[PDB]
C-alpha cells in the first residue's frame, strides 16, 4: 500500500510544472527508499531524472515496488487545483488504478479529495553512463533564466565556452551576434550570487535554445543551478530540490554537421 | 450513379467481343476480370466510382456516399479480401500517411513535438517532418531503436485513423481496357 | 426627471462585469423605494434579480415610475472609463431618450460626461414565489469561487448534498471523479471566515458547472455567499451589496435522466 | 570613431519602445552637437523628431557625422535585453556598418556585448518651420494618457476646444458622445499637477485617435507633456527627456470636410 504524506504540497506543484509541457507521459517509478521518474520527450533528445528521496516525505510506507503509467498534463490539472500551503496526501492502492490525491487545507475546514485513471505505459529502463565533467559551474537561477531567455530573440543556437575567465555565452543570427559572459564571483559569501567555474579544460559546443528554455521553468524550485559539461558529452543541468532529491536534464550537444546540412 | 454502373459495365460487356483484346490480355489479366463481375451487383460501385477519382490514401470518414448503404464497410471487407481495396495494412510509408493527415491535424502533431516553428504552411510542416528523419545518433541515447519514424507513423495512424488505396495492377489493367476502348 | 447621486462608484461599477457576460438587455423599473432589475437571461435558463434601496444613495429623487431598456454591453463599456473612487451622479430626465453620466474626481478637478442612448424594450415580468428552503448555507464568497473553478476542470456537473458537517460539492468527470467537502465551523469570531448549515431536510441535486462559473463573476461585490436549496427548487444564490440592497441568482436544477436503466 | 557612454540606460530602452510601432527604419543623424533624429512614419502621416544634445551623455566624441540607417524593430529586441539600470555604451568604428551595444551590470559582474549590421537609407531632410501657437498647455502625461485611451471606446474623432478656463476633450460615436473637460489648476505645489495653459485665440480641432493612442507611447520619459496646437498648424507633442533632450511629435489636423462625407 502507497502512502505518503507530504507537508509542502507546493514542491510537488512546481515539479509538475517543470515536465507539464516537456513531457506527456511517464512511468512513476515508486520504490521504499523514494520516488525516482526518468523517461524522454517526444522528439526522443533529452533525459529528465528526478531523485525524490524518503526522508523529506514526513509519512513513507512503500509495501512493493510499484509502477504507474500517469497522464502528466492530467496530473497538472489537478494539482493546480491545490493551494501553495496545503498538505499533500498522495496515497495509491494496490493494482487499483486509482491514485488518490487528498489536499488537506492548512486551515482544517477544507477537505479536498480527487481521483484520477492510471494508463499503461511502457519501461525502457534509460541507462545513465556515470562519467566526469572537465568544466563545472554553479550560478544563480534567475540569471540562467534570464541569459536563456534572452538570447532566443536573437539566435537560435548558442555556443558556450567554458573559459577560466568566465563562461561567455554566444548566439549568431540574422539580427546580428551578441556574447554574454560572467565573472568569478569573489567576495561575495551569499549563495545566491556566487558564479564559481571549475575548470578542467576549455570546452566549446552547441545547443538548441527551444530546449534550454523548456528547461528552466524549474527555476522556481531552486535559487541555484549548476552545469557540468566536457567534450562529446550531453549537458547536464542540476537543480537541488531543498534535501529531498534533485531534478538533473540532459542535453545533448547539437551535431557539428547538422548546420553544415 | 445509374451512369457510372450502366457505362463501365457496358464497356467491359462491349470489348468481350473482340479476339484481338483477348489475343492481347494475359491469362491472368482475364481471371482478375472475371473476378470483377463475379463481386456483388451492389459492391460494384465502390470500385467503380474511386476508380474514376484521384489516386490518394484517403479515409472513409471523408466518404460519404450513401445510395448503396451507410455502413457499407462488409462490402469494403470483401473488396479488401478480393485484393481490390487495399485497407490501413501495409501504411509503413511516412510520406503518405503526412499527405493523408490533415493541416490542423500535423499543427497538433506539431505541438506535441518540438520542432522549429510550429506554424506554417501544409508542406512545410511535412518536409520539416521528414528533416526529423536523419536522426539514428540521438534516439541511440539509450537502446538503439531507431524507429523515430514509426514512433511519428504510429501517432498519425492514431490521429489518423482508417484508410484505403486501389491496388496498382487492376488499376493498370483496367486503364488498358478502356484506353483500348477509347482509341483516339 | 429622475437624478441618483452615488458616492460609491465602484460598487456600480462591480455590478456590471458580473451581469455583462450573462444578459444583454434589461429594463431598470425606477421607483421611489429604489432602483430594481429582474430580467430572465439570454438562454432562457437562468434568472438575475437586482435591487437597490434608495435610502444608501446619498442623493435620490424620481417623481414617477421609469423603466429604461439599456444596452447591459455598451454601457458596461463606458464605466471601465471611469475611475473606481468616482462620484457617479446618474440622471435621466422625464423625456426618456438618453442617459447621462456625471462621472467625477475625489479632488474636483476634472469631470467626465458621457450620454447614453436608451431602448424600447417588452417589459416581461415574472412573479417569483417566496418560499422556505430545506438545506441553506452561508459561506465565504472567495471560497466558492475557487470551488466552481477547480471542479470545471473535471467535469460539467456539480452535485449538491447538504450533509451533518457541511456540503459535498462532487464532480464527475471522464478524466476522475473530484469530492470536496467543507467542514462546518461556527466558533470563528470572524463571520467572514466562518460556514453555517441550517438543516431540516437532507436533499441533493446538480447543475451545470458552466452557469456557476459566471455566477461568481459576483465576488469582489461581498465576501459571504448564502446559498438556498429544496426538492425540485431552483438553486438560490445571493450576494449581499454592502447596505446598498442585494443580488439573487436563480438556477434550476437538471432533471435527472434515468441513465440508470 | 563615435563613442557614447549613458549611464541613465533606462532612457534609452524607453526611448527604443516608444519609436517600435510608428517607425520601421530611421536614419540617426550624429554631430559634435549630439545624436539627432527626423524621420516621417511610416503611415505618411505623422512627422517624429529626436534630439540628444552632448553634454548630457556622461562620454561622448564623434569626429566625423554619420548617418546610419537602423531597422528600428531589430533595435528594440536588442534593447529589450540590456537590463533597467546597465550603462550603454552606444560605439561605431569609422565607415563600418555594424553598431556595437555594450550593456554593463550595475556590480560589474555581467557584460553584455552585442552587434548590429546597418543598412543603407536615403537622407531626406524634412523643413521645420518654428512659429508661435495659438494654446499651449502644460499638462501631466498620466492625465492624457488616460484621456486618450479612454476617449477609444466611443469614437475616432478628438475635438480639442481650448478655452479660458481648461480643456475640452470631446469626442463622439455611434455609441453615443463623451465631453471630458478638465479645469484649470494653478495653485499647486507641485509642477507635476498643475495644468497651467496659455492662449491668444481660441482653437478648435479634430486628429486622430489610432495614432494617438500611439502617440502617448512615451508616457514613462516624463510626466509633463507640453502639447501645443495652432491654427492650419501640425500639433505638436514634446516631452522633455529630463537634462537629456527633447521628443517632439508632429501631427496635422484632420479636415472637417472629410467628416461629411
Request: charged share 25%.
Amino acid at each position: 500500500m502507497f502512502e505518503a504524506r507530504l507537508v509542502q504540497g507546493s514542491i510537488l506543484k512546481k515539479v509538475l510544472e517543470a515536465l507539464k509541457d516537456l513531457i506527456n507521459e511517464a512511468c512513476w517509478d515508486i520504490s521504499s527508499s523514494g520516488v525516482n521518474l526518468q523517461s524522454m520527450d517526444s522528439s526522443h533528445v533529452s533525459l529528465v531524472q528526478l531523485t525524490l528521496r524518503s526522508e523529506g516525505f514526513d509519512t513513507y510506507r512503500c509495501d512493493r515496488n510499484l509502477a504507474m503509467g500517469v497522464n502528466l498534463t492530467s496530473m497538472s490539472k489537478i494539482l493546480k487545483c491545490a493551494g501553495n500551503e496545503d498538505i499533500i496526501t498522495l496515497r495509491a492502492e494496490d493494482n487499483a488504478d486509482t491514485l488518490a490525491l487528498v489536499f488537506e487545507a492548512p486551515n482544517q475546514e477544507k477537505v479536498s479529495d480527487y481521483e484520477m485513471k492510471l494508463m499503461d505505459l511502457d519501461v525502457e529502463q534509460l541507462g545513465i553512463p556515470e562519467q566526469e565533467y572537465s568544466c563545472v559551474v554553479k550560478m544563480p537561477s534567475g540569471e540562467f533564466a534570464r541569459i536563456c531567455r534572452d538570447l532566443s530573440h536573437i539566435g537560435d543556437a548558442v555556443v558556450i565556452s567554458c573559459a577560466k575567465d568566465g563562461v561567455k555565452f554566444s548566439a549568431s543570427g540574422e539580427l546580428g551576434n551578441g556574447n554574454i559572459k560572467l565573472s568569478q564571483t569573489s567576495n561575495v559569501d551569499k549563495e545566491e550570487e556566487a558564479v564559481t567555474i571549475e575548470m578542467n579544460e576549455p570546452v566549446q559546443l552547441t545547443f538548441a535554445l527551444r530546449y534550454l528554455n523548456f528547461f528552466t521553468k524549474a527555476t522556481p524550485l531552486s535559487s541555484t543551478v549548476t552545469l557540468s559539461m566536457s567534450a562529446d558529452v550531453p549537458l547536464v543541468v542540476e537543480y537541488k530540490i531543498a534535501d529531498m532529491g534533485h531534478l538533473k536534464y540532459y542535453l545533448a550537444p547539437k551535431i557539428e554537421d547538422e548546420e553544415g546540412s | 450513379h445509374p451512369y457510372y454502373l450502366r457505362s463501365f459495365l457496358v464497356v467491359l460487356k462491349t470489348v468481350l467481343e473482340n479476339e484481338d483484346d483477348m489475343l492481347l490480355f494475359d491469362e491472368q489479366e482475364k481471371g482478375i476480370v472475371t473476378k470483377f463481375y463475379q463481386l456483388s451487383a451492389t459492391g460494384q460501385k465502390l470500385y467503380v466510382r474511386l476508380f474514376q477519382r484521384k489516386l490518394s490514401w484517403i479515409k472513409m470518414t471523408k466518404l460519404e456516399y450513401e445510395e448503396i448503404a451507410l455502413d457499407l464497410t462488409p462490402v469494403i471487407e470483401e473488396l479488401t479480401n478480393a485484393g481490390f481495396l487495399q485497407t490501413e495494412s501495409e501504411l509503413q510509408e511516412l510520406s503518405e500517411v503526412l499527405e493523408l493527415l490533415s493541416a490542423p491535424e500535423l499543427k497538433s502533431l506539431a505541438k506535441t513535438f518540438h520542432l522549429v516553428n510550429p506554424n506554417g504552411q501544409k508542406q512545410q510542416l511535412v518536409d520539416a517532418f521528414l528533416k526529423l528523419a536523419k536522426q539514428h545518433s540521438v534516439c541511440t541515447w539509450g537502446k538503439n531503436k531507431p524507429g523515430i519514424g514509426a514512433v511519428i507513423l504510429k501517432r498519425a495512424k492514431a490521429l489518423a485513423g482508417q484508410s484505403v488505396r486501389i491496388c496498382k495492377g487492376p488499376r493498370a489493367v483496367f486503364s488498358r481496357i478502356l484506353l483500348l476502348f477509347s482509341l483516339t
